[PDB]
Symmetry: C5
Subunit: 269 residues, 5 copies
């Protein structure tokens, strides 16, 4: 009996994980947190490369880096502690002494990441029709609602599929609102800047859309091939954590780097 636990624990407790699955998941989480610490150093060391008015972006990027490093390190340790090798069959099985594995660790830490990532672009682009404070408030409210509803949802991904899907849809509504507001922000930011900055802003928009869409994908991952599908397996576990790592790097580090490049081009010198 596992109750309201993530599906990684069910797979680990019934079939277990092959060497490749367990080792790969550990490797990808380690890569994640190492990327976050390296990004922290990068964003600190390049602060003085942009005009004063843009440096708040670098600062917020560093804040996000700290959050992500700490969380991903904890999550890597959680993964390696929750599953242990069984010599008889050569697979890693659920070790309850390590606690059940739970992805929710990320969700609450998104309560840092999402507000800040949405916030920092407002320190680079200049709005035209929209009010700064109103856009910020909309970002923050919709982000909080999205994160909390998805957090509740993911606890039931095995024990109660209906709650899982309903909470996911409720979260998706706020997600769509966030996408709308960000589209407005980028469009207004394009107005009245050099074509190079406009190209950077278009790249930022594409990056934002794809990387942020990856997260509900990881949310749904075990069921993307339906019940007892190919992905309801260790393959799905690997896929979920890989998608998480790609999304983390893209939405945080590369996003911050593109914002820094935009700040450089908009800066005098």
């Amino acid at each position: 009996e596992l109750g309201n636990a993530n599906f990684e624990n069910f797979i680990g407790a019934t079939e277990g994980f092959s060497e490749i699955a367990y080792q790969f998941t550990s490797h990808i989480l380690t890569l994640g947190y190492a990327v976050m610490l390296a990004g922290l150093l990068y964003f600190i060391l390049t602060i003085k490369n942009v005009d004063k008015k843009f440096q708040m972006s670098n600062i917020l990027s560093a804040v996000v880096m700290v959050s992500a490093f700490l969380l991903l390190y904890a999550q890597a340790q959680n993964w390696t502690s929750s599953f242990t090798f069984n010599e008889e069959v050569g697979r890693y099985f659920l070790d309850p002494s390590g606690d059940l594995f739970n992805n929710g660790y990320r969700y609450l830490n998104w309560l840092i990441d999402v507000p800040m990532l949405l916030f920092q672009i407002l320190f680079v682009v200049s709005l035209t029709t929209s009010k700064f404070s109103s856009v910020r408030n909309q970002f923050w409210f919709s982000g909080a609602m999205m994160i909390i509803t998805g957090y509740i949802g993911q606890f039931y991904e095995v024990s109660n599929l209906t709650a899982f899907l309903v909470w996911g849809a409720i979260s998706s509504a706020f997600f769509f609102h966030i996408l709308w507001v960000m589209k407005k922000v980028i469009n207004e930011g394009k107005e009245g800047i050099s074509p190079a900055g406009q190209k950077i802003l278009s790249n930022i928009w594409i990056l934002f859309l794809i990387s942020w869409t990856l997260y509900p994908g990881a949310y749904l991952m075990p069921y993307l091939t339906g019940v007892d599908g190919f992905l309801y397996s260790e393959d799905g576990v690997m896929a979920r954590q890989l998608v998480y790592t790609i999304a983390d790097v893209s939405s945080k580090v590369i996003y911050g780097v593109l914002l820094g490049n935009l700040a450089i081009t908009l800066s005098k010198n």
Copy 2:
């Protein structure tokens, strides 16, 4: 099973145990706490040069509080996860004494850093008018120390001796009310003779201070806010206590420091 003067989390964990949701949520919220504290440390260090020299002591004290809070919340998260272990037969997390009993006192003693400094730093932004700096500082520090120490004594008896728990809590509340009085005076005097933007920021600071600080005795009382054998005397109350702690920590420390920095900026 004999637990003595232990927090009610240990009694819940030893009798009913914790569901996956309760245990995991508590771990998540404590992790969020310490991550917020370290991020705030970085923010306050990186923004020091944004204010006039005379105001930078506030940034420095914010960073000090951030260091204290990060260390404490990290240790407390590890304590939580070490004290409770999964029982596979029933699927619940039960008290694991090899990890030591869980105790909230870790927070309390670290408040001996946070409370004096948080109360101190506001005096580096506002200018007093009728009140003396040294007098306000000494009152803040004495009353904070007494509040913290009495509440610390109280919380050990929250299960073993409800009477001592409540008496120590009331004694602490007296010093708390004194602190609220002194802070109200400080905010009012700080409003005198400053720009309207600063006055709006100071009003916001007062409201934030009042609510966030009042949350702490709420967490203190949490297991009994629905009476004996109430709805909250359960894993729900454990979750609520740690949630309220995290909200109060973030609001009273990080947001407080940020608003103080904004006030310093407007006054520069």
Copy 3:
């Protein structure tokens, strides 16, 4: 149960065990200690540029002492929590030999950083008149080293051999008195030719130094301050010893450095 030349904390833990309150309080006070030390490190680094170049060596040495103290107190907190484990049947923490016996000697050898540097750093703020810098430094360093090493040898015998314990303590006390004399001379000469505010700060520094440094032999003698089989030869004495250690640490290091910084500011 054979413990040999071990500190009395282990004997209390192996015979009576520790109640929840005693164990938890000791953990809390050691954690508070190391958190205070890290916060002090941050403060002293961030305030370096607040004083003239000639005084900044004091800030730097304060930071060095902070590093030493943080590392040592963190290690000691981990040692405390590893050495004693909960017994479910009776609800007390007993000696867990897999965690090693508890020993305060960790502090003593780390004083070989703290004591030379603390005594040294004051020579970068005050100006001597009749005394020679090098002579004062050398006397400070020799007497500190001898005091620390002899007390270190002594504390291993606080239970196994009371005679060696007391004899080594007295030998240490002689060098302690020599240090007190030299520090009195230094402070008196430092008062000569500076403003009255600096003189008041120096008087405060002297009082702080005397009390905080006297606290250490108090912790040394703590288990026997009520004689054999006294009230303090118990978990109460363990709590008192670590509490006195923490108060002395904070006072002699952080507050001492802060007062020195204020003196440097007034002299700048």
Copy 4:
């Protein structure tokens, strides 16, 4: 006992076990590795201001690589010490599955940081002539990623499936050769129009790059460099592999960065 797709260190440790010398030396060499990486981090940060502004990006990228390498090598040292435990009866260290299986893949995924950045940073010191910056960078990044991913897949089968091991290794070697080609081009173009001292520094950089990077497929092949049941299919091969890894890491990262810094100094004014 069944180990599946595991590195040969696990098979040696589970069958013969490790003598004191082999186990201790491997631990020492991994510890030395991560210590060198953190020291290099400090050096590259402290010497940033020794070069003109335009060259400081090289210092920054060196520091990023140092962070990656430190984190990875520390984790790997802990993994080594966790996977093998002393057996009192015979005096050898045997596989301790409770510590998890030992796997070199930790280094491969972190190369996804190291290789792109190491190749990138030289473009902030040398000036290209006929080649385009973006094209060289894109080729570097794509070929490095493919090399790393194919070798990572390969190394899981070094015992369980020699054929897949060798096929994936060859595919990786192709991208390696492409990288060597592009780097030779970069060095040649960089030599044009700089002082003879800088040209000598660039020649040294080329030799260092070639040797240090070639050491890595050597470590890949190590257990079989003396054939089946050869001298190296033993604890000697395990220690030799980790030794080659550490030499290659230090040379390809720290000494590479130091030579680039010296080149930047000579080019500065």
Copy 5:
């Protein structure tokens, strides 16, 4: 039972075990060591700007050495405490093989950082007269590497094979004497043409170097300095060895760097 090529600390711990005083003292001295190293790191960073630009590299190298030493000593402290565990029945700490055997080799490989850098950094303060910079550097580095490697091989056999122990020690001692010769020359040339205060500082540095560096072969020989079954082949010898290591480390690294900084100050304007 069978310990093989292990350090004598493990033999003492496995046969007689360690009393409370011996075990606790060794742990305390290792902790003191690494604390001193981290404090020195902070000191050397914070005082960089106290000397003229051309001398600041010395500060940097001191910081580099501090990092290495810190990491190594930290690891060694934990290693000590993991290798020996209290036996309740008799009240002594005995070898706990689950923690791994204790090995001093951790120090030796980290000297491959410490020894070259310590020898290198003095060349950034003193001016040579008859000797060539590159020649002195090359000789220092080669002879240091050989000394370290030969001593490292030797120390594994200090119990299992006394003959190899002494032969490798003597081979190391030859390179040690060469290093002493070259350093004496360097000090003599550095004294020429500087103020007498600087000359006195250099004399003090020479004395410090000679004594502190000679302490290391003393620790090498420690268990046998009173012959077979001597007073020092005991827990007293273990304590003495680690104490000598700590004194030598502090003197040869921290105090050495401080004296070099003082020399740089006196030569500065």
